[PDB]
């Protein structure tokens, strides 16, 4: 029933989602380069459409790029679908207004039908995953139209958005804050969740948890997969009690405006038996809501919560959780109207490397500092309309740009004023 | 035991033949005069016949429009092996036109030809079919083996045809007609062979010439290669292997549809010469090694075309988990089309060579085939298309439609291949 | 009087029969290559022709092949005597219709003359076993045939064919899945029972619960003998109450069309002690009905049981056996018809490797998995007609092609609909 569609925009997104594609068969038992099996564990009908022997990924895979197809042939083989790859014939050159505007309505027409189908071979549709880059061309312009379009023809589905956003010290190219605010616009209004992803957390992540020596983008990319299947696992494994996507909204998002989540998981294993058994739910508790650990260039143990989630994998026992959440409730800080703080799950079934495994998301006031140091790039080239002519000469008025802006500050500030006024709410 | 008659055709054909022979008496401890050499080995019956006396005689026979590849094979290569009553020899040669070979000499030496052949076949009970060595170059290859192949299969159409078409190279070997030749040729070997296997010299000589980049090997490398290639192909019809027990099987495992019966082969070591000293070449990386760009004998990469069906003949011990490990680590490196299983069989027979722990070779039905045939293709209609030395052939009885029929035929057959392509 | 005459066809055909002939001849206390014995254990006059000192095993060895005999003497010695050695004169190409209808009629007629000699130095026939492979051009087409010549010479005699079919994953030849199927028709119309046998299977047993580094064939084959020692065992050594071939079909094949069956057998044993003294009727109860022992590409534990038998060796204590049994039942589930599930029986006589030893057969909706897949196939390369010609230019009608598959679906849809029904005939 609880079916998953997921969308693969632009050069990221389709990268960070095969890594994930990648991962899931192995933990079910499918060739990862040619989606045939024999024997298979889990529930696979989440994610795979069975036909014969062959599991074929739900995924609608988009660009705008002239070559789509046999860029993916070269590094996935014949794992995907090729009626599934929907091919551009120039591309947007990092500008959102390319992607959003000047993309063709024949391209996204064909986005549209292969979303269809996707969602025509289904019992019911669980919900939607988008897998983007927000400096992108395409993945941030394109695949916010695609998000409003989903939006607009599904709505009541939780739609989920894994995003990369630009990293807190150096950035990419100029335009990049453009790019980002748009893309965060569009966020903000469309979906139901959005976790927030960047470069230079995972750098320092992939430096020092992971032992691999001058990692690239490639390993870099087993992160952000870590992350993306342990938060499916419930799904794929069942289990008497279980998460959906309808869970994780409904548990995570106290407002409609305030969605956008942080991820952390431990441990963090590259394929091999490299893992050390710790085996203590403990442990990975401590780890996993310390900074260390978290996904995105923020610091949350200096904020305060709103909401989160944790989810164990494998066999942890009822009495070290309740003892390890003792511990997190007593050293973090929430908000008082949220009284329970916590949605807490477990999946009895252990992630391919490691007996036991963790993954936790939440609603960290702390957040705002990204989108903070987002707004500030952006006022300052803004001001004095460097690289602008780029999107004003692409369709933009200087009203959409200042729309955009206003929306994501009218998020930064209501994310701050509760955060300030949580303080007295105790007394 | 299942006997095969080896027909060598052409300057080259029969260039081959000392090596080739050479191998076959070595691997099967027999000298080079027919005299047994201690134990032998091997269904020796197959391919040589015993004399009234205690010598064995190479069940062969080797077809010249001019006098001197025979004379000089015969005379001062491998004396006394080969029976000069199974040497066929004209006078003219063949001025390098297909039209000598096929239409307007050759055709008077059929009945001396078919002659040898039944005189070569009355000596045995059960024949399992001919293997014709022929370059596809020049004109006594080209031309005489395709008319050689028509009057066998017409006579005895139960037996399994096989031929070795030989490629000449673009420049050690090349010829300014060669593209009409070879097209020329295509087009008969198209109906005549069950089996045709095609052999590149430059993919030779590249290969070669890469290997011996450390040394300065021989002069004679090119030609053991060549001839190696045969006899390895042939080891699983001379030895009591579980593969290619029989051309029939051969035939069946291989060739789904009549014409699409042109294979590309694979080996490795190459030649024991190339790979001395230390040469414990392991299960795994012997298979690696015959995907491998460096030792296909075709301009084809493996990964970039699509398989129709794929036969690994190793010798020596190869554990069957090793394989089955090595076919699984292929990946889409071999890939078919979606209408097959991916049925690649693999398994090993007995080694001779006492310097090498192992070895193998393949046999490939692979789309790659249609793009040397389109090379050709195109070479022959730039010059036919301005008639470049056409009155050559003409002069001969080639009139015009029968070069036209040729273009076509090709055409349809490279659109054949190339069809799981798309 | 139980009196039993196999039949060795093609090369599979002898490797396979070969292990188990020299494995039988460890049992009873015989040379395994001269077949002289002094000293002998068992009813030996089951499988044994005794001519002063020589035990002489009774089996007919058929090929087409040309020299069959001397590939004999050159790995089993003397222990066939070469009159019952049918030598061929060229052989079949993979191709079941060479090994079907181009084989000799002299060819055949030889072939039962020496049937007819072996029943003719028996005082009753106690049944018949076939060796063979289904993806070969004689253990297929000319064992077919065979089969159906002793069925129509000498019907109500239990034959029994052990057989290997396509592996689930990677195939042999292109033409592979024609020979299996027509093969699988003969085998339908007229084997009593039919053991299903592949070497994927059998591989992942070799590398997993035998100590053998690289296996090759030569180890496979072990792991087939010993499933035929074991299934021969009660018959071999006697006992007040035992199990002929007659007591199988009559308790494993409720319907006439649904004798395949699932062979499993544990400890696997090579010679030498290498083996751990377990000595627990348990546990090997535990082992021979889980996924692990099977000799077939399927999963037992997941599908329905109509019947299942099972045969312990060696000193196994009846207090263990019901114990283990109960286990067993509460575990697995079964048909409702049949309500008493099982055939159980004992033989005192331990395997020479092990002092226990359990080998298990059954019908298991299960197996329709091996042959749907050989269909589907088939059905793809006969409705392109690759490598079809091989078929209709050696003497079958695309008539033959197409009842051939018609008689495997109706196997197929009848353990199917069986099995769903199932699950109402308990309310
Ligand atoms: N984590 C991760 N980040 C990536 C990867 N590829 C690109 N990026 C980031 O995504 C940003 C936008 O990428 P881009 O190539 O312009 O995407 P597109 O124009 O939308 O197809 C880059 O500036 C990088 O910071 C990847 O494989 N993984
Ligand atoms: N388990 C086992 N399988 C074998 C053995 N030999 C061959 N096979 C399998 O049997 C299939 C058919 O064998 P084949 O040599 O063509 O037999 P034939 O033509 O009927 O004599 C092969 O493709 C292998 O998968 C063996 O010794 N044991």
Same mark, same amino acid.
């Given at each position: 029933?609880?079916?998953?569609?997921?969308?693969?925009?632009?050069?990221?997104?389709?990268?960070?989602?095969?890594?994930?594609?990648?991962?899931?068969?192995?933990?079910?038992? *499918?060739?990862?380069?040619?989606?045939?099996?024999?024997?298979?564990?889990?529930?696979?009908?989440?994610?795979?459409?069975?036909? #014969?022997?062959? %599991?074929?990924?739900?995924?609608?895979?988009?660009?705008?790029?002239?070559?789509?197809?046999?860029?993916?042939?070269?590094?996935?083989?014949?794992?995907?679908?090729?009626?599934? *790859?929907?091919?551009?014939?120039?591309?947007?050159?990092?500008?959102?207004?390319?992607?959003?505007?000047?993309?063709?309505?024949?391209?996204?027409?064909?986005?549209?039908?292969?979303?269809?189908?996707?969602?025509?071979?289904?019992?019911?549709?669980?919900?939607?995953?988008?897998?983007?880059?927000?400096?992108?061309?395409?993945?941030?312009?394109?695949?916010?139209?695609?998000?409003?379009?989903?939006?607009?023809?599904?709505?009541?589905?939780?739609?989920?958005?894994?995003?990369?956003?630009?990293?807190?010290?150096?950035?990419?190219?100029?335009?990049?804050?453009?790019?980002?605010?748009?893309?965060?616009?569009?966020?903000?209004?469309?979906?139901?969740?959005?976790?927030?992803?960047?470069?230079?957390?995972? !750098?320092?992540?992939?430096?020092?948890?992971?032992?691999?020596?001058?990692?690239?983008?490639?390993?870099?990319?087993?992160?952000?997969?870590?992350?993306?299947?342990?938060?499916?696992?419930?799904?794929?494994?069942?289990?008497?009690?279980?998460?959906?996507?309808?869970?994780?909204?409904?548990?995570?998002?106290?407002?409609?405006?305030?969605?956008?989540?942080?991820?952390?998981?431990?441990?963090?294993?590259?394929?091999?038996?490299?893992?050390?058994?710790?085996?203590?739910?403990?442990?990975?508790?401590?780890?996993?809501?310390?900074?260390?650990?978290? +996904?995105?260039? +923020?610091? =949350?143990?200096?904020?305060?919560?709103?909401?989160?989630?944790?989810?164990?994998?494998?066999?942890?026992?009822?009495?070290?959780?309740?003892?390890?959440?003792?511990?997190?409730?007593?050293?973090?800080?929430?908000?008082?109207?949220? =009284?329970?703080?916590?949605?807490?799950?477990?999946?009895?079934?252990?992630?391919?490397?490691?007996?036991? #495994?963790?993954?936790?998301?939440?609603?960290?006031?702390?957040?705002?500092?990204?989108?903070?140091?987002?707004?500030?790039?952006?006022?300052?080239?803004?001001?004095?309309?460097?690289?602008?002519?780029?999107?004003?000469?692409?369709?933009?008025?200087?009203?959409?740009?200042?729309?955009?802006? &206003?929306?994501?500050?009218?998020?930064?500030?209501?994310?701050?004023?509760?955060?300030?006024? &949580?303080?007295?709410?105790?007394? | 035991?299942?006997?095969?008659?080896?027909?060598?055709?052409?300057?080259?054909?029969?260039?081959?033949?000392?090596?080739?022979?050479?191998?076959?008496?070595?691997?099967?401890?027999?000298?080079?005069?027919?005299?047994?050499?201690?134990?032998?080995?091997?269904?020796?019956?197959?391919?040589?016949?015993? &004399?009234?006396?205690?010598?064995?005689?190479?069940?062969?026979?080797?077809?010249?429009?001019?006098?001197?590849?025979?004379?000089?094979?015969?005379?001062?290569?491998?004396?006394?092996?080969?029976?000069?009553?199974?040497?066929?020899?004209?006078?003219?040669?063949?001025?390098?036109?297909?039209?000598?070979?096929?239409?307007?000499?050759?055709?008077?030496?059929?009945?001396?030809?078919?002659?040898?052949?039944?005189?070569?076949?009355?000596?045995?009970?059960?024949?399992?079919?001919?293997?014709?060595?022929?370059?596809?170059?020049?004109?006594?290859?080209?031309?005489?083996?395709?008319?050689?192949?028509?009057?066998?299969?017409?006579?005895?159409?139960?037996?399994?045809?096989?031929? %070795?078409?030989?490629?000449?190279?673009?420049?050690?070997?090349?010829?300014?007609?060669?593209?009409?030749?070879?097209?020329?040729?295509?087009?008969?070997?198209?109906?005549?062979?069950?089996?045709?296997?095609?052999?590149?010299?430059?993919?030779?000589?590249?290969?070669?010439?890469?290997?011996?980049?450390?040394?300065?090997?021989?002069?004679?490398?090119?030609?053991?290669?060549?001839?190696?290639?045969?006899?390895?192909?042939?080891?699983?019809?001379?030895?009591?292997?579980?593969?290619?027990?029989? $051309?029939?099987?051969?035939?069946?495992?291989?060739?789904?549809?009549?014409?699409?019966?042109?294979?590309?082969?694979?080996?490795?070591?190459?030649?024991?010469?190339?790979?001395?000293?230390?040469?414990?070449?392991?299960?795994?990386?012997?298979?690696?090694?015959?995907?491998?760009?460096?030792?296909?004998?075709?301009?084809?990469?493996?990964?970039?075309?699509?398989?129709?069906?794929?036969?690994?003949?190793?010798?020596?011990?190869?554990?069957?988990?090793?394989?089955?490990?090595? *076919?699984?680590? !292929?990946?889409?490196?071999?890939?078919?089309?979606?209408?097959?299983?991916?049925?690649?069989?693999?398994?090993?027979?007995? /080694?001779?060579?006492?310097?090498?722990?192992?070895?193998?070779?393949?046999? $490939?039905?692979?789309?790659?085939?249609?793009?040397?045939?389109?090379? /050709?293709?195109?070479?022959?209609?730039?010059?036919?298309?301005?008639?470049?030395?056409?009155?050559?052939?003409?002069?001969?009885?080639?009139?015009?439609?029968?070069?036209?029929?040729?273009?076509?035929?090709?055409?349809?057959?490279?659109?054949? %291949?190339?069809?799981?392509?798309?």
């Amino acid at each position: 029933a609880g079916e998953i569609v997921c969308i693969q925009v632009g050069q990221a997104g389709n990268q960070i989602a095969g890594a994930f594609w990648q991962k899931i068969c192995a933990e079910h038992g *499918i060739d990862p380069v040619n989606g045939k099996a024999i024997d298979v564990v889990g529930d696979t009908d989440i994610f795979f459409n069975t036909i #014969g022997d062959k %599991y074929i990924p739900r995924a609608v895979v988009v660009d705008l790029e002239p070559a789509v197809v046999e860029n993916i042939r070269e590094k996935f083989g014949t794992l995907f679908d090729p009626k599934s *790859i929907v091919s551009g014939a120039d591309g947007a050159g990092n500008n959102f207004a390319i992607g959003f505007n000047e993309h063709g309505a024949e391209t996204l027409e064909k986005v549209m039908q292969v979303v269809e189908q996707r969602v025509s071979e289904t019992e019911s549709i669980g919900g939607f995953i988008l897998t983007h880059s927000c400096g992108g061309g395409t993945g941030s312009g394109f695949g916010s139209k695609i998000l409003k379009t989903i939006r607009e023809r599904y709505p009541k589905v939780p739609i989920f958005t894994f995003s990369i956003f630009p990293s807190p010290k150096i950035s990419e190219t100029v335009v990049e804050p453009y790019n980002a605010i748009m893309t965060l616009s569009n966020l903000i209004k469309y979906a139901s969740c959005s976790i927030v992803l960047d470069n230079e957390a995972l !750098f320092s992540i992939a430096e020092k948890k992971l032992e691999v020596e001058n990692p690239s983008l490639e390993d870099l990319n087993l992160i952000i997969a870590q992350v993306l299947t342990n938060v499916t696992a419930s799904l794929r494994f069942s289990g008497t009690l279980n998460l959906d996507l309808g869970k994780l909204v409904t548990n995570l998002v106290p407002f409609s405006n305030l969605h956008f989540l942080m991820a952390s998981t431990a441990p963090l294993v590259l394929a091999g038996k490299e893992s050390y058994e710790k085996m203590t739910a403990k442990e990975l508790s401590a780890q996993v809501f310390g900074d260390e650990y978290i +996904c995105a260039a +923020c610091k =949350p143990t200096t904020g305060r919560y709103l909401a989160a989630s944790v989810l164990f994998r494998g066999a942890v026992k009822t009495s070290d959780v309740n003892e390890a959440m003792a511990t997190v409730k007593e050293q973090n800080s929430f908000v008082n109207w949220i =009284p329970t703080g916590f949605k807490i799950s477990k999946s009895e079934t252990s992630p391919k490397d490691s007996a036991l #495994g963790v993954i936790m998301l939440g609603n960290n006031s702390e957040i705002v500092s990204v989108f903070e140091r987002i707004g500030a790039n952006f006022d300052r080239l803004w001001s004095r309309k460097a690289f602008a002519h780029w999107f004003t000469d692409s369709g933009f008025e200087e009203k959409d740009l200042d729309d955009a802006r &206003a929306l994501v500050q009218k998020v930064i500030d209501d994310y701050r004023k509760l955060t300030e006024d &949580a303080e007295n709410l105790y007394f | 035991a299942r006997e095969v008659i080896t027909i060598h055709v052409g300057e080259l054909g029969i260039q081959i033949a000392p090596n080739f022979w050479k191998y076959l008496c070595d691997e099967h401890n027999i000298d080079y005069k027919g005299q047994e050499k201690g134990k032998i080995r091997g269904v020796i019956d197959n391919f040589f016949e015993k &004399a009234s006396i205690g010598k064995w005689i190479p069940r062969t026979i080797l077809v010249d429009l001019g006098p001197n590849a025979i004379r000089k094979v015969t005379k001062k290569d491998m004396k006394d092996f080969f029976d000069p009553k199974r040497c066929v020899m004209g006078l003219a040669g063949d001025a390098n036109l297909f039209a000598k070979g096929y239409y307007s000499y050759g055709t008077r030496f059929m009945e001396e030809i078919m002659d040898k052949i039944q005189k070569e076949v009355d000596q045995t009970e059960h024949l399992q079919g001919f293997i014709v060595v022929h370059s596809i170059g020049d004109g006594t290859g080209a031309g005489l083996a395709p008319l050689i192949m028509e009057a066998i299969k017409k006579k005895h159409p139960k037996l399994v045809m096989m031929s %070795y078409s030989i490629v000449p190279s673009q420049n050690m070997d090349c010829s300014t007609i060669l593209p009409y030749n070879a097209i020329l040729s295509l087009d008969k070997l198209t109906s005549c062979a069950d089996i045709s296997m095609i052999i590149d010299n430059d993919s030779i000589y590249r290969i070669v010439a890469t290997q011996g980049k450390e040394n300065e090997l021989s002069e004679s490398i090119f030609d053991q290669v060549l001839a190696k290639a045969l006899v390895e192909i042939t080891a699983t019809l001379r030895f009591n292997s579980p593969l290619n027990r029989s $051309m029939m099987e051969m035939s069946t495992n291989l060739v789904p549809f009549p014409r699409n019966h042109f294979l590309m082969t694979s080996m490795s070591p190459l030649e024991t010469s190339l790979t001395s000293a230390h040469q414990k070449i392991e299960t795994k990386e012997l298979m690696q090694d015959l995907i491998d760009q460096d030792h296909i004998l075709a301009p084809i990469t493996v990964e970039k075309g699509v398989f129709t069906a794929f036969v690994i003949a190793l010798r020596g011990e190869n554990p069957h988990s090793i394989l089955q490990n090595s *076919i699984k680590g !292929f990946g889409d490196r071999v890939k078919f089309s979606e209408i097959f299983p991916t049925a690649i069989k693999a398994d090993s027979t007995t /080694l001779t060579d006492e310097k090498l722990a192992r070895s193998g070779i393949t046999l $490939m039905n692979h789309s790659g085939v249609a793009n040397l045939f389109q090379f /050709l293709l195109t070479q022959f209609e730039l010059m036919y298309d301005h008639d470049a030395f056409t009155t050559w052939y003409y002069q001969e009885g080639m009139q015009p439609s029968e070069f036209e029929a040729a273009k076509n035929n090709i055409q349809k057959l490279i659109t054949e %291949y190339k069809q799981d392509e798309y």
